[model samples]
Target: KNPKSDKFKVKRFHHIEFWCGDATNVARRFSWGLGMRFSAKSDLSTGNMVHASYLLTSGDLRFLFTAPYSPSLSAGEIKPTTTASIPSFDHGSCRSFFSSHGLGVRAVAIEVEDAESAFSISVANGAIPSSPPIVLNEAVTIAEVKLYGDVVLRYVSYKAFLPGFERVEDASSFPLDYGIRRLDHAVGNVPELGPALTYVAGFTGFHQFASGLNSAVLASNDEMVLLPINEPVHGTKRKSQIQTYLEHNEGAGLQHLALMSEDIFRTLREMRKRSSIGGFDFMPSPPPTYYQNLKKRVGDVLSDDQIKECEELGILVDRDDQGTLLQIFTKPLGDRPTIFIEIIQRVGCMMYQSGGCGGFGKGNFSELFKSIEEYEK
Candidate 1:
């Protein structure tokens, strides 16, 4: 992966965190329904007495679901009708926030070369310090900062989460193979993406990413290491998916999370199987002609077998001088139609050195746009 400059440097994501009311069932859904296994946990039964958390891991993807004991943020605000299973986390964290917002992403933990350095910079830039830095082990230091609304951003030691929260494999195994590898990025749908990008860039002393003035699709970073902020631009041909999300989400919050699959063909196949068994659905598919166009666009990257696989699985393709990138989107996992998922695979992109690039499927925008249009009607 290409590295970042020191002032704006963040290596990659550590783990994505959620503040949910029901952590157990949600964690199980990810386990049996998506092929993630239990990695680590914290609860009254084990150690933490204020809230309960269950972590699941599959390759480089790790998720932390935390449910507060039931709790308050301000004297006049609605007090959460629960208690803290976690120790002393300032009381109103998950219980109150998840109560008002429903179960959604509340935070994302980022991995950096120096958490202390990142923290020092954030504090000087007007970001409120949520937690002071603490060392986890010889390999770890942890800290946090508050963001718009109640969203939190954790700056933690270590480059990856499974290392910090690794669990011993049990003798039992599930036969399903969903083949997901890592988190690509997490997107936030806010009222104005400009300010969010400004906030992040201010902390790093760098310029922000300007997607476009038209505002249909937005990306967090040019390639890797990111947090994309998006908002609905009112006058699109139809209600954009970001518009739909912002309307239902009730305020700024996480929009979607992309999971990287090493093997796109196998991953979507199993995902289809599990959808039948577990009741989740992929996004509306592109018309059959989209695949024919796909074959023309991504010329040597897909073999005959791969094209057939793409058609059968409804996978979408986008390519550049760097290589071909394959992707597929899922419908909102919840009834709110607020948050969804993406399964992406970057293929044959490591060799081209002419400052080659790999970003989200810019070429597939119309196909994706039409699908979102149909999602509304």
Candidate 2:
């Protein structure tokens, strides 16, 4: 059962970029909401006249917010000719994307072992090339492939935040830390599962690690990067949440990003304190019976007091043969009710392993959907 051949190595997610109407404000909102700090930026001050970008970071998690400048501020055909220059972006596409998706993810960038090799292999594996590998400098190379919908998959062998962005020095005065570690997984909602699954698995060589009634998690060989994809199902009495996401998002796109935390309780407490002050609001918790059956379903993975705390804080818990996972989701980050954030903590899930000790909350999916249904009402 040893399969050897054409596969390019992917290290992990470098950053996730969002297309927004206002990069400065949205970046600040996400910063305060998730306790990520503004680390770097690209704007007119940085010789980027076409768009403004801000980078937010918490531990290894990098979130980039970018918005195109109004047509009045557009520079005349400024091409990226140097390694330090910011590349030109299609401002019209950004505006149209905002109209359709409303502050949604545009790119999921991954740090690969070799950008050129990854790009060529993926294209040969049937990926539609968005751009050939672009070498920013001696050490950095970047390429893109069209992922589902309007989103793109960026492959880069760079080490820094990105080219054309300068590091920030003065934003560290305010201490805001919610204990978020890194991106555990990013879930995308598509119209169909089989094609998207095959497309991604074909390009990246990821395998199906876990599954649900309408969702599948594709993981890298090293089990470091997990990409869970979902499709709307029929025959259900009510409209499926995935279908709602597709409709509201106006197409297939990123549904939510799961950020890993060391202590979910602590993180939730901090997040809740700020919710009243322009921070992110969480979705409603499950019913009381959910808490009652927690112990019976998942066993003694969590203490009775912890279970009670989960109910109080609206956290959900589930376990696999390896270990347990604690998770909670926020309300939509914007007005569209499409894209959101998920906070997760994987207990006893070590790195470079086979099993998904950090279970994807398979047992709690129905409870979560029910809560969403009630909230929709």
Candidate 3:
């Protein structure tokens, strides 16, 4: 069976490429925390002048950060988002997006079992084609399609699939940094939920991992939480973080990216160090009440020590029928409020057990939403 055709199979995030005005500074925030230094570089300095890009990796994550060095970086001129929806192979999207959303995610690359079949199915299911299948080299095969908010989805044979991106030493070797294993899921904010869901979910054959009618968010789990993380569970309550994102971003765009980790406690501790002790911005602080409430709520299952550490670090916790999860969210990266980050640890979700439920921390929504909402104000 083609794994991409299955509702819940793909879980590995190959890499996420961001379109930013300053690839150097944007990459620094990611590496400073985990020390993910540059694994590859492509620019005038590296003999490629189309667009400046750097590839970074740590644990099991890979990212490509790129920006247009020239107004005419595209093979052709860039196009408008509404009418001229289609752009050239390099997408010709970076130039336009930089002016619109500033620094944000441009494409999310996923490793599919069959790049060829995944491409066929996506386009047949109403996806706008970005590029047809192309073999970058003997080492890589790639395809691209557009998702909502001008975000591109690249299906590839491998995460590091691309010619001239020469693979090199692990970025974690950077002296001071954070360790991010992989991306858990990415959240986006759009005008409506149904169409965005209908397009990518239906076309990609991704499964519905969870839905919060109150928050107006639906997911296939591994890669989406698209209504933004801080929205009310349902519209009946209060405005969600999604509404704020769409309003500020002025339309659909990336809201947050969930990073996966194994030694979360260790990861979080270091994150706190970087933010507080390392002279960087700290993550949004969680209410001490969150821990008090958590103690009463999950006090039966987890130790006070375990819950206390989360409270101290501003991390969140959730438990389900199958297992427990530890997670935390960083405040919006820049002043934009358009993007942020999440670090999640599923007790044993990655072991691939027979009945593993490597899903989102659904149980944490109530408090998580409140915590996220607090930041928007």
Candidate 4:
């Protein structure tokens, strides 16, 4: 497939199934915190696993959160555990990136059409199948696969009408308080295996939306070099074993999921209000240094007060000739420390993160490296 040509058409992003040790608890916390409506529960007899799904929709994007039963496995044992062995900080600015739902298993799911065709195309082109096509019932057949080293892609074919389809309507009734909406984008970790993963993307028909050099920005100020991976670059240094595992382990897993809102300022205010009301820390508070540099680098474009406001709120801002965007990263969701979430608001820009360098994962790689070093000592 010619991924660059956009010949392969994906109807929409459907759902994500992540492996977690406790499916019920993960589902409960995620649903409650995100204000997602609980849809249905199911039994996966084939894997001896039970699953539940939460539904979120505004405009064209439909996000389904699936928590699957995790088989017994030791830490770093390479079993069918839902968590990845990536190291993320428990404190610091990263915490404000996602809704605080406690730590658990996590994965991302994108809905797509032609499950069998997509699977065949991906496999023929070098993508590896984590789970083969299996019929969950008469209506739904899904094939779970991976590209690069850790990025996961699942193809699901479900009946037009399913038991919980009505939940989508129910979700619509509750209008989104904030005008900003949509599943803007998602990020994944692809290790040093960029070449191999690029080959897999070619097979699966995903375009290289963005790219950047991690070592140049975080490792050294002068060492700017273009990284050879697709969009959603990983920042953790390739030298660190944990960073390597985050990118290469189990063949390309999701690093973070991003949700785009129309009114970022208002949404953030509400998020803060919710955090205060819930009496919990949902996301990380970013360092003041990031904003300090924002003023120094982009001072001509933004006012001092604007920069200070963002810094105080732990939001990161990036901009270019076309427009600007605000973004923040969250702490890891589970003990394995692989998956997290990102929230972004873009205004008058076609680019993601202001044509910024490789999104948030790359932005924070060095910090993660230092974290690993300290843990080892």
Error of 2 at 299 (Å): 4.9
Among all candidates shown, the one with the greatest lDDT: 2
Superposed Cα deviation of residue 12, candidate 3 (Å)? 2.1
lDDT tens digits by residue: candidate 4, 175-239: 54443355655544554545644564456545443423322111101111111232334453334
Mark the regions of model 2 whose C-alpha exceeds 4 Å error after superposition. Answer: 1-6, 71-74, 78-88, 171-173, 211-213, 351-355, 366-377
TM-scores, each model vs. reference: 0.82, 0.91, 0.80, 0.61
In the range 1-377, model 1's lDDT, one tens digit per residue, is: 32233353566677877787788878877777667877777665553445678887778788888776533322232213222322224546556776666777876787777888888888888668877776554567777877545677777766344223334347433433488877876777777767776676556543333222132222223344556667666765667776666667667778778888878898888888888677468877776677665556775778877888988998888876666778888888766778788888877646421111355676577765654466455
Candidate 3: tens digits of C-alpha lDDT, residues 82-199: 1111122343467678777877887877777667677887788777888786655455667788877877777777435366555445553454446567676777767776677777
- The local distance difference test score of each candidate is 0.67, 0.82, 0.64, 0.46
Candidate 4 segments exceeding 4 Å error = 1-3, 39-49, 56-107, 131-141, 148-151, 157-180, 210-252, 276-309, 350-377
Q: Candidate 1 — which residues are off by over 4 angstroms?
A: 1-4, 70-90, 136-139, 147-149, 158-177, 205-223, 351-357, 367-377
Could you give the C-alpha RMSD of every candidate to the true structure, in order shown? 5.5, 3.3, 5.9, 10.7
Q: Give lDDT: candidate 4, residue 309.
A: 65
**Model 4 lDDT, full chain set:** 0.46
Best by TM-score: 2
TM-score of 2: 0.91
Cα lDDT of model 3 overall?
Answer: 0.64
User: Deviation in angstroms for 261 in model 3?
Assistant: 1.6
Distance (Å) between predicted and true CA of 213, model 1?
8.5
Sort every candidate by lDDT, greatest first: 2, 1, 3, 4
